[PDB]
Amino acid sequence: ADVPAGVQLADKQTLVRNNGSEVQSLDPHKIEGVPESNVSRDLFEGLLISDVEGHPSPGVAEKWENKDFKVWTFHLRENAKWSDGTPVTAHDFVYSWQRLADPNTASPYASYLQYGHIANIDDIIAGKKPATDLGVKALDDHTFEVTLSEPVPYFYKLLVHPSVSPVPKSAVEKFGDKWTQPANIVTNGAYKLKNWVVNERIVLERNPQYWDNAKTVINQVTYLPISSEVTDVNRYRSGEIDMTYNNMPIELFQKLKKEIPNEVRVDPYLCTYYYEINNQKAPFNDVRVRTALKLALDRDIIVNKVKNQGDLPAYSYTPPYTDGAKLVEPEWFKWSQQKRNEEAKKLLAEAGFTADKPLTFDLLYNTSDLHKKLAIAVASIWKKNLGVNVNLENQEWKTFLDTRHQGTFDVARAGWCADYNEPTSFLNTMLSDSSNNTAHYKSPAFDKLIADTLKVADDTQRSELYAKAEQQLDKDSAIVPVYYYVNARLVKPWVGGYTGKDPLDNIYVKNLYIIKH
C-alpha cells in the first residue's frame, strides 16, 4: 500500500470484507467467480498484477519482452517466495499452466489458455497431446517463456487472472483436494490462509515471505460469505463489516445514498447482467422463443424502476465501454416497449404457443436479495408482456455454477465481468468449445468472426469484427441482455487505498490501509 504523507494509521490494521457467497474453492484452477477471485488475489500472485488503478503491472515478473507478440519472455524477480520460504520459480509457472490445460483438472478456465493462444492448447484440451506439450518453458529458474500460435498484442493483459497464478506442486501432489486446507496450503501472495470455516468466514494473515511485504499494511483480512445484500449492509452499519460486497439491496439503497453518501461508492464496472438461456435445450433451441424473451423484457422498468442504482439498459454482451468496443446498437433497442411486445408475442405465437399451451419454464438464480427481487420483477414483466409462466428457483453460488455447466437448466440469471479489458474477454466465452460457455451456444459463424480477429493486425478491423460478433450473438438471441453494471458498494471512511478507478475491480488487500478513527 502507499500511505499518503500525514495520514495517521490505526493501531490495529485489520479489515473485514463481505464476499457475497461461500467460495467454490481456493484452488486457482477450480474457480471462476468474483468471490473466488477476490480471495485468490490476496493469496496467489501471477506474472503480472493490477496496480491500484487497475493497470497491468509487475507481479512475480519484474520485467518482460515480446517478439512479434508471439514469444513472451518474463523475467521473474529473484526474491519472489512462497509462504514456506521457498523460491517462486519459472518451473512453478510451467507446472501450473500445464495443470490448468490438463483435462483431468477439469478447470472451468482451461480455455483461458486458448484465449491467449498458447501453443498446442487445442490438442491438449482435446486429449490429443499431453499437457507437457504446452508452449511454456522455464529457460532458467527466473525466466518463464511463453510461445503463442499467433500474435496477441494484448496477451500480457490476461496475466493478472487467478487461472494463470502459480500453485505449489508439492502440496497439490501430497494432499490432493485438501491441499488448500490451512494446515497444508502454501501461498505466494501478500497473505496466507489462517482460518477457513465453511459458510462462516475465511481469515487471511499477512505473509512475511511475500517479496513486497514491507509495503503491506493490513495484517489480517476476513472474507465473509453473506449472500443477503440486506444483511451485508446491516452488518456494515453495525460496525462489523468494513467493505460490503458489491451487490446492493433494492430495499435499502435509496435510503443509503441519502443517509451515508460519502460511503456509497459507485464506479464504472465492466460487467453485464443478463438472463442466460440454455441454448441446447428445447424449446430454448428455437430462436423465436429466445428472441421473444429478449424483446419482451422491459429494461427501462428493471433498470430505472425496480433497481434504480445507476445501471444502463443493455443490448449486447460485451459492455460498450470495454477498451476496443465500437458496438452497433440494434434497431430493436430503439423501439418502444409496446413494439417489442407485439413482435415477441408474434414470434411465440409463431413458435406454437397458445393460451391453453403456454410457455412455462424455470428461472434459476443464485441465492440473493437482489437477484430474487429482479427475478420476481422479470417473471411479472414476462407474464404481463408475453403471457409466459416462470418458476423461480434459488441455489447457493457453488451449486448454481455447477448447474449451469451441467446444462441442468432452462434460463438462469447471470453476470460476466471482464478478466482483461478487451472485447474478447467477453466474446471468447461464447465460442463453441469454451470452458466458460454456460449458454451452451455453438455458432460456427460466431466462432469464425472471433478467429478472424487475430488474423488481421489492424485495430479497426478487429473492432469491426467484435461488433459483427455481437451482431451474430444478437441475431441468434443467445442471451437476454439486461443491464451493464455499475460497481456499487459501501466502504467505511477509514478504509484508505480503494480508488474505484479500476473498471475490473481487481482489489488487493495489500494496497489498503486503516486510517485512525
Minimal distance in Å, beta carbon 369 to U ion?
5
Minimal distance in Å, beta carbon 81 to U ion?
32
Long-range contacts: 345-352, Cβ < 8 Å, 24+? 345/292, 345/296, 345/385, 345/386, 345/387, 347/288, 347/289, 347/291, 347/292, 348/288, 348/289, 348/292, 348/386, 348/387, 348/388, 350/288, 351/283, 351/286, 351/288, 351/289, 351/292
Minimal distance in Å, beta carbon 475 to U ion?
26
Residue type, 367: T
- Name which of 62 and 323 has its Cβ closer to U ion: 323
For 398, the grid coordinates are 457453488
- Name which of 82 and 409 has its Cβ closer to U ion: 409
- Name which of 133 and 410 has its Cβ closer to U ion: 410
Minimal distance in Å, beta carbon 374 to U ion?
12
- Name which of 11 and 356 has its Cβ closer to U ion: 11
Separation between Cα atoms, residue 373 and residue 50, nearest integer Å: 34
Q: Which residue is nearest to U ion (CB)?
A: 11
Minimal distance in Å, beta carbon 224 to U ion?
18
Separation between Cα atoms, residue 21 and residue 486, nearest integer Å: 20
Interacting residue ranges for U ion, rule: CB under 5 A: 11, 323, 362, 369, 410
DSSP characters for 116-147? TTBTTHHHHHTTSS-GGGSSEEEEETTEEEEE
Nearest CA to 92 out of 172, 38, 179, 194 is that of 172
Separation between Cα atoms, residue 178 and residue 185, nearest integer Å: 8
- Name which of 369 and 474 has its Cβ closer to U ion: 369
Look up residue 437 and give its DSSP letter.
-
Minimal distance in Å, beta carbon 421 to U ion?
7
- Name which of 473 and 495 has its Cβ closer to U ion: 495
Residue 401: how many CA atoms within 13 Å on its side-chain side? 21
- Name which of 28 and 54 has its Cβ closer to U ion: 54
